[PDB]
Amino acid sequence: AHAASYLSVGYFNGGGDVTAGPGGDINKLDVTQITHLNYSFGLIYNDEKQETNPALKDPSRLHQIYLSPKVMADLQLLPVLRKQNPELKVLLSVGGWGARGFSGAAATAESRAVFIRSVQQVIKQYHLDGIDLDWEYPVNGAWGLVESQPADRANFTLLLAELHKALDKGKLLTIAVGANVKSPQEWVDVKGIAPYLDYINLMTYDMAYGTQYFNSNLYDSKQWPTVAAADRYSANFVVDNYLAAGLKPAQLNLGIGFYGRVPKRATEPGIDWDKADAAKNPVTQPYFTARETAVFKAMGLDLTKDSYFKYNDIVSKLLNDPQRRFTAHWDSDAQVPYLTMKSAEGKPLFAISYENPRSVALKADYIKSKGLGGAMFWEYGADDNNRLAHQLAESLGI
């Protein structure tokens, strides 16, 4: 006898991001289409020896939050955003891909207390509704990209318990978590931290690695199948792995990518580490030649360094390429769009998968049928005239 209520939590890369690039213009965003805005990112002053941002190496601020000048300027504009949407909640997200400092911040009673005091200071100075922690990743360290240790799992739980205790009542505490099956298994005690969190943002994207073609497929593709088992991911598979770990669906937001990736399979041999003499016997081989890589390079995407392509750029540069080099397709099993480019020999080559309005609506339908709490998306600056956010708002009744 009543309808559901859903979240739509939009990350916004305002300060700049390691993989997504320099920050966007906050003034472009339509904040009426979202329930929550995760302004990204605050960073962490840290003593990691490999830290290359010298601002973060200030020893007098160790374990506190760093806000760049652009982040501080953008956060000044919150009163304007709140007037636009009086129901909007605004959090600062701390961390992001490659962001150092969480392992050390979490490590001791003393370090945690410094970090928590800094969270409290920032929330009060900028009048935030809460804080989102995007630690990529406890225990795993993103495969050595940031410092990590096995104690990170338990220390993250302590940090969240203590931060929950320190936050004013009514403030929000949220986190983002990885797609990798090891995240709920080994990196993060999801069951243990659930009582401290308002909701959990699932990073159900960045799957176009190894032998997998699709970046954010809802279900596995059959036409374009992943070869190695350890690479075989889908948004639904990730959701089920988190549900198996004992999270309730209503606490979860399904992450949706407002971007695509050229699969690594296009340019790098795909290794199945479950095979004999694996590194010498790749199970997939690159199908881009210099011809294809040059097309992407000319558009500003150097595939030797990165594969990220914003949705707005997919629309302007790929779909609407004046030379008509890219053909749009739909994968009915995966429930997402993808583009092909024609090889010199005439064969369609899988160039990139992404999300469009139809696929965003299908992920909203999944949210509704699975009883998830809502959607999250990365990130609003990559939308095309706020269209994907609008589709999500419409589909979820925001």
Author numbering: 18 to 415
From the paper:
A single-domain GH18 chitinase-D from Serratia proteamaculans (SpChiD) possesses multiple functions, including chitobiase activity to release GlcNAc from CHOS and colloidal chitin, and a hyper-TG activity with CHOS (DP3–6) substrates, generating long-chain CHOS14. Certain chitinases display transglycosylation (TG) activity as well as hydrolysis, forming new glycosidic bonds between donor and acceptor saccharides that can be used for the production of longer-chain and/or well-defined mixtures of CHOS with new or improved biological activities. Catalysis by glycoside hydrolase family 18 (GH18) chitinases proceeds via a substrate-assisted mechanism, which involves an oxazolinium ion intermediate and has a strong preference for a GlcNAc in the –1 subsite. SpChiD displayed an exceptionally high TG activity, in addition to its other inherent functions, and this can be exploited to increase the yield of long-chain CHOS for biological applications.
The SpChiD substrate-binding cleft contains four tryptophan residues (Trp114, Trp160, Trp290 and Trp395) with Trp160 and Trp290 flanking the entrance and Trp114 and Trp395 situated in the catalytic groove of the binding pocket. Half of the space in the SpChiD substrate-binding cleft is occupied by a loop (Asn30–Asp42), and the front face is equipped with Val35 and Thr36, which may provide favorable chemical interactions with the incoming substrate. Phylogenetic analysis of 131 bacterial family-18 chitinases revealed that all the SpChiD-like single-domain chitinases from the Enterobacteriaceae clustered in a distinct group. The novel loop and tryptophan residues were highly conserved in 18 of these enzymes, confirming their divergence from other groups. Therefore, Trp residues at the substrate-binding cleft appear to increase the affinity of substrate binding, thus influencing the TG activity of SpChiD. Mutational analysis also confirmed that Trp114, Trp160 and Trp290 are necessary for TG, and that Trp114 and Trp160 are the most important. The proportion of DP1 produced by SpChiD after 72 h was 96.4%, whereas the mutants V35G, V35F, T36G and T36F produced 54.8%, 96%, 51.4% and 59.5%, respectively. These data suggested the importance of residues Tyr28, Val35, Thr36 and the entire loop in chitobiase activity of SpChiD. SpChiD is active against polymeric substrates, which may depend on the flexible nature of the Asn30-Asp42 loop at the binding cleft. The ability of SpChiD to bind DP2 may favor chitobiase activity over TG activity, whereas perturbations in the positioning or binding of DP2 for chitobiase activity may increase the number of available DP2 molecules at the SpChiD substrate-binding cleft and thus increase TG activity. Further, we conclude that the substrate-binding cleft of a chitinase like SpChiD regulates multiple activities, and could therefore play a similar vital role in the 17 other chitinases present in the same phylogenetic cluster.
